[PDB]
Design a protein around this ligand. Structure first.
Ligand SMILES: O=c1ccn([C@H]2C[C@H](O)[C@@H](COP(=O)(O)O)O2)c(=O)[nH]1
Ligand SMILES: O=c1ccn([C@H]2C[C@H](O)[C@@H](COP(=O)(O)O)O2)c(=O)[nH]1
Lengths: 316, 316
């Protein structure tokens, strides 16, 4: 089966994994150095062993492709993946006036009444970013995030570099280039950053008219993280191939610190008892070819018949 | 055996490898995405199936560790690995007055008389960089190279960042940091560069008091390149572990475009018929602990009993 590598990864972590502590107060079972690949011509690696919201994936990837760093776009598609980070900026602001939302997330798990308070404060925030253009510009903009790293890498002289843009051009004019890399990691920012890029770097490769892509991920959450991560990138491989008029090859996922939080042991175990099902299929608008102008209506996922979803507490 | 992974890599390329063209006018047999690891507590992965000059490795690594970008240091240790690049700058200069050294290297293979001329011009260059301080400062300095990337990453405001320096500090104060990355890849330079870093990025990891390191290499020459590359990094893992007072773990080598030039087929084949021998051992000066101040006399390689060397034409 196509998703077998993921399940393989999960079991391995359950065996060779060593308990290692981390910043998120929850014990983890980690592994350093792991590589798995997916032949994209066999199917789209969206997990069938647990329902994975392709919608959130599609819209978040498009957010990146546009070079957008503002949460507003995400919110208008019912994608709250990036809310937490923008909300922090808001609550730590002097312009903020409301209940002490300190250590929230951690504080939510341990305080049901506070949680409803917190969730209400958030509801306000999302609303204002969606309506108050100044507020959005002032608190909805993440600034340093994948879109600005991928497409607006600030040069040491005011300029901005569109990494992805040039790479895609290099792929057309020089398919056999061993230098087709896009990096999300910038040393100057890394220390002054809330969350340095989990998706550190990726490389495209062309051979026999098929386009492959490899991703180096310094840190990964086996349960909650990896399923979305495999999706975002197997899709990006398709997207770039679609533009460049190339066939799709393999998606190679290389890990640094692959880890399973101890509070997801039962869940990952249950998912493991499930038998995968045939992989879904991707369908990209044949007319439209410039991926930067794509929209939700352009990417179709046929035949995705997943198993039921699995609820697991996020670690924080 | 410890070097088995290398030989495994070689065979695989000879089988699953697909002919792919490249910039260096010689056909190659490539593979995209490959990972191999070496348990350093079993031995130092210096190839025993062919004599590999550990001297060149040791001195080049120290060059990096010092944050030195000038060829002069290398030349005073009989290390000419980096001559070619500095020589180019010289011959393309207006201050240069001598025979047209265009397309040399390629031109050398095809022109014996010219080769002796070229080799003589070089002899002059090396001599002057070693003696003429102004000339060294003007033509011996590579500028953008591993030492300046590792330790003098220029910030977008005049400053300079000592990546390695901080990481090593982070390893001591936060061993379990999943963010222990040093990147050699800078988007602003990459287009304006003679040779964008082959050794793109690396990550340290700490668990059970053992220090492991993973390297992402976008491009690799299986025959001539990989043996030195495994050495430089397995050593660096030792060096950083020595400083941080940690045990040594594994060295994980992840490849992007692993390739074997078609003119090394016979040689790699011959090397393959050889049986590996017990791995050598590293010995680092127990007193001296700050690796940045290390010198040749500090790193000892015990019991290295290699097979004879293998001559193979460099591809260019
Ligand atoms: O899609 C994603 C986003 C984040 N992470 C994870 C990795 C870690 O679980 C946590 C980051 O920890 P640090 O390495 O930055 O400390 O977020 C993923 O695996 N997948
Ligand atoms: O120690 C080294 C130095 C360089 N390279 C190689 C990789 C390619 O053979 C060539 C660079 O080709 P490009 O990818 O930059 O085009 O140099 C190595 O493998 N090992």
């Amino acid at each position: 089966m196509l998703e077998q590598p993921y399940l393989d990864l999960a079991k391995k972590v359950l065996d060779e994994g060593h308990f290692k502590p981390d910043r998120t107060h929850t014990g983890t079972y980690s592994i350093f150095g792991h590589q798995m690949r997916f032949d994209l011509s066999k199917g789209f690696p969206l997990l069938t062993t647990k329902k994975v919201p392709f919608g959130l994936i599609k819209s978040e990837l498009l957010w990146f492709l546009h070079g957008d760093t503002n949460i507003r776009f995400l919110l208008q598609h019912r994608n709250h993946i990036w809310d937490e980070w923008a909300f922090e900026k808001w609550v730590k602001s002097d312009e903020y006036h409301g209940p002490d939302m300190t250590d929230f997330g951690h504080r939510s798990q341990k305080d049901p009444e506070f949680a409803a308070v917190y969730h209400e404060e958030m509801a306000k925030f999302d609303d204002r970013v969606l309506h108050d253009d100044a507020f959005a510009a002032k608190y909805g903009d993440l600034g340093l995030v994948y879109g600005s790293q991928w497409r607006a890498w600030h040069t040491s002289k005011g300029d901005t570099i569109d990494q992805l843009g040039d790479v895609i051009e290099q792929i057309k004019t020089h398919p056999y280039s061993r230098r087709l890399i896009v990096s999300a990691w910038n040393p100057e920012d890394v220390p002054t950053m809330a969350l340095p890029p989990c998706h550190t770097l990726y490389q495209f490769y062309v051979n026999d008219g098929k386009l492959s892509l490899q991703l180096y991920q310094r840190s990964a959450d086996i349960f909650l993280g990896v399923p979305f991560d495999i999706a975002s990138y197997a899709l990006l491989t398709h997207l770039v191939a679609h533009e460049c008029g190339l066939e799709v090859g393999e998606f190679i996922h290389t890990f640094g610190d692959a880890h399973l939080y101890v509070n997801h042991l039962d869940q990952i175990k249950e998912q493991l008892s499930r038998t995968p099902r045939p992989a879904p299929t991707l369908q990209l608008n044949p007319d439209k070819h410039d991926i930067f102008d794509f929209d939700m209506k352009d990417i179709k996922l046929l035949n995705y018949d997943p198993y039921p979803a699995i609820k697991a507490p996020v670690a924080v």
